[PDB]
Write a protein that binds this ligand. Structure first.
Ligand SMILES: O=C(O)CSc1nc(-c2ccccc2)cc(=O)[nH]1
Ligand SMILES: O=C(O)CSc1nc(-c2ccccc2)cc(=O)[nH]1
Ligand SMILES: [Cl-]
Ligand SMILES: [Mn+2]
Ligand SMILES: [Zn+2]
Ligand SMILES: [Zn+2]
Length: 455
C-alpha cells in the first residue's frame, strides 16, 4: 500500500447558538482542535450565504505549478483566464487525466494519485491556479458593502463568519490596528483545479487562519498540531536542507510538498480532512498544514488573532529574530496602539493586552540597562511607526524595530535592535544613540489604562 491516509481531524457541527459568535466557539473547541492543528466546522443548515458571480467578467492572472515532492516553491509570485475559461480548462484536465466524468472520480483515488504523481519525477504534471486578495477585477465571495444588495446579501454583511468582518470584530486583537497590512487583515481568494496544491507552511506571526470553501469540488487538507512544529521542521531539514538556506526577504520563503506518511514515519502526528463546499477549516497557531484541490473550486481565507494568540505572537517574533527572518508587522507596535486605545477596547482584550505589555516593559527595561552598560549614553525619542517597514529592520536579525533601536551617525539610516548593539559599526559605543519610542515613564501609565479598562 503506497499511501495510508492520516486519521480524520475533528469535525464540529455547532448549533445556531454556539455558531453565532465565532470567537466564543473557537475558544470552546480549542482544547480539542489545538491537539490536531486543524479542524473542520459545518455551519448550521440554514446559514447559507448567497454566492453570485458572472463567470465571464471575473478574470485573474494564473500561477503555474510543478508537482514534485521536496522541490522548492515560494508562496508569493501569462494571459488572464476568466473564471469560465479557467473552469473549462480545469474540468477538461481532470476529465482527460482520469478518462472519467469529474464527479465520478472518488476523492480517495485523487488523493492516492496525487501522492503517486508528486513522488515520480518521471511524471511532469503542471497545473494552474489563482491566488490573490480581493480586487475590482475579482472580488470577495462574501457580500461586501458598496450596487444595490438583495435582502439575502444584506443578512450576511454583518456575519461574524463573513471573512471580511472577522479581523475587525471586537474580540479580534487586530481590530484597532492602524498599520496597513494587506496580508493579515484582508482575505485571500484561491481558485483551484485538480491537484493544484498548497505546500507545507504555518501562518505569518503564527496566527490562526479560517478558510471557507464557497463552491466546487473539495479541498483536501493535512494538518499538524502546534506542539509538533519543530519536529516537522527537523524532518524537513534532514530531507530537504535547501529550503532552509537564508533568503533575502519575506517574498522569498521556500516551501515544499511532502507526503504526510513520511512525517508520520518520523513520529509527527498528522490529521486529514476533505473540506466540501459550505464548510470551514480552522488552523491553529503554529499548526503546519498543506493540501491540494480535488477539482475546480473557489475558496476564501483570512488570518486572525485572538487573545489566546497574543503570547504566541510574542514568542513568534523572538523565534523570527533567532532565525533572522523578516516580520510582517511589529508586535510591540500593535500592543502600544491597543494600549493607546484602552478606553474603547473589549475588556477581555484589555486584560490580555495588559499582561503582554507587562512582559514587554520588563524585557525592554532589562535591554536598555544592558545597552547603557555597553556605553551607549546619548538618546532621543524616535517615532518608528513613521518609517517605511524596510527602513527600520535590525541590520543583523531583520526584526522590525519599534520600542527602541541603536543608530550611529557613521551609518546614516541603519539600525540595530538592542540585542545586536555590537553589530552596527566599528565606532565606539559613546558615538551611538539609543532611539526610543517611549520612556519607561510613558509606558507604565499606558499599561495602567489597560488595567483600569479590564477593571
Ligand atoms: O468527533 C469529532 O470529530 C469532533 S468532537 C471530538 N473530536 C475528537 C477528535 C476527532 C478527530 C481527531 C482527534 C480528536 C476528540 C474529542 O474529544 N472530541
Ligand atoms: O494556503 C492556505 O493555507 C489556504 S488553502 C489554499 N492555499 C493556496 C495557496 C496559498 C498560498 C499561495 C498559493 C496558493 C491554494 C489553494 O488552492 N488553497
Ligand atoms: Cl511529478
Ligand atoms: Mn495557511
Ligand atoms: Zn537585531
Ligand atoms: Zn559608526
Amino acid at each position: 500500500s503506497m499511501f495510508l491516509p492520516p486519521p480524520e481531524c475533528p469535525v464540529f457541527e455547532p448549533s445556531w447558538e454556539e455558531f453565532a459568535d465565532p470567537f466564543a466557539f473557537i475558544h470552546k473547541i480549542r482544547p480539542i482542535a489545538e491537539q490536531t492543528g486543524i479542524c473542520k466546522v459545518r455551519p448550521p443548515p440554514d446559514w447559507q450565504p448567497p454566492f453570485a458571480c458572472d463567470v465571464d467578467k471575473l478574470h485573474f492572472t494564473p500561477r503555474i505549478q510543478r508537482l514534485n515532492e521536496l522541490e522548492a516553491q515560494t508562496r508569493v509570485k501569462a494571459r488572464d483566464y476568466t473564471l469560465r475559461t479557467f473552469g473549462e480548462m480545469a474540468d477538461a484536465f481532470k476529465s482527460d487525466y482520469f478518462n472519467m466524468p469529474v464527479h465520478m472520480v472518488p476523492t480517495e483515488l485523487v488523493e492516492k494519485e496525487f501522492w503517486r504523481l508528486v513522488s515520480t519525477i518521471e511524471e511532469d504534471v503542471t497545473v494552474e491556479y489563482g491566488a490573490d486578495i480581493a480586487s475590482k477585477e475579482f472580488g470577495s465571495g462574501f457580500p461586501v458593502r458598496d450596487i444595490k444588495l438583495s435582502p439575502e446579501e444584506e443578512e450576511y454583511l454583518d456575519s461574524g463568519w463573513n471573512l471580511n468582518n472577522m479581523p475587525v470584530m471586537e474580540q479580534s486583537v487586530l481590530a484597532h490596528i492602524t498599520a496597513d497590512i494587506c496580508g493579515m487583515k484582508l482575505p485571500w481568494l484561491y481558485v483551484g483545479m485538480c491537484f493544484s496544491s498548497f505546500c507545507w507552511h504555518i501562518e505569518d506571526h503564527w496566527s490562526y487562519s479560517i478558510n471557507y470553501l464557497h463552491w466546487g469540488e473539495p479541498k483536501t487538507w493535512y494538518g499538524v498540531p502546534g506542539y509538533a512544529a519543530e519536529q516537522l521542521e527537523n524532518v524537513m531539514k534532514k530531507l530537504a536542507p535547501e529550503l532552509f538556506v537564508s533568503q533575502p526577504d519575506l517574498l522569498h520563503q521556500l516551501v515544499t510538498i511532502m507526503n504526510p506518511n513520511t512525517l508520520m514515519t518520523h513520529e509527527v502526528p498528522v490529521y486529514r480532512t476533505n473540506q466540501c463546499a459550505g464548510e470551514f477549516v480552522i488552523t491553529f497557531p503554529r499548526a503546519y498544514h498543506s493540501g491540494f484541490n480535488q477539482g475546480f473550486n473557489f475558496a476564501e481565507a483570512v488570518n486572525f488573532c485572538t487573545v489566546d494568540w497574543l503570547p504566541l505572537g510574542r514568542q513568534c517574533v523572538e523565534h523570527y529574530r533567532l532565525l533572522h527572518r523578516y516580520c510582517v508587522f511589529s508586535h510591540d507596535e500593535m500592543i502600544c496602539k491597543m494600549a493607546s486605545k484602552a478606553d474603547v477596547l473589549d475588556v477581555v482584550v484589555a486584560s490580555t493586552v495588559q499582561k503582554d505589555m507587562a512582559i514587554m516593559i520588563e524585557d525592554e527595561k532589562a535591554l536598555r540597562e544592558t545597552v547603557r552598560k555597553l556605553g551607549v549614553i546619548d538618546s532621543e525619542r524616535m517615532d518608528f511607526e513613521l518609517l517605511p517597514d524596510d527602513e527600520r529592520q535590525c541590520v543583523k536579525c531583520k526584526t522590525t524595530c519599534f520600542m527602541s533601536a541603536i543608530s550611529c551617525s557613521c551609518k546614516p539610516g541603519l539600525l540595530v535592535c538592542l540585542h545586536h548593539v555590537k553589530e552596527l559599526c566599528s565606532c565606539p559605543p559613546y558615538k551611538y544613540k539609543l532611539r526610543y519610542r517611549y520612556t519607561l515613564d510613558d509606558l507604565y501609565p499606558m499599561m495602567n489604562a489597560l488595567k483600569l479598562r479590564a477593571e
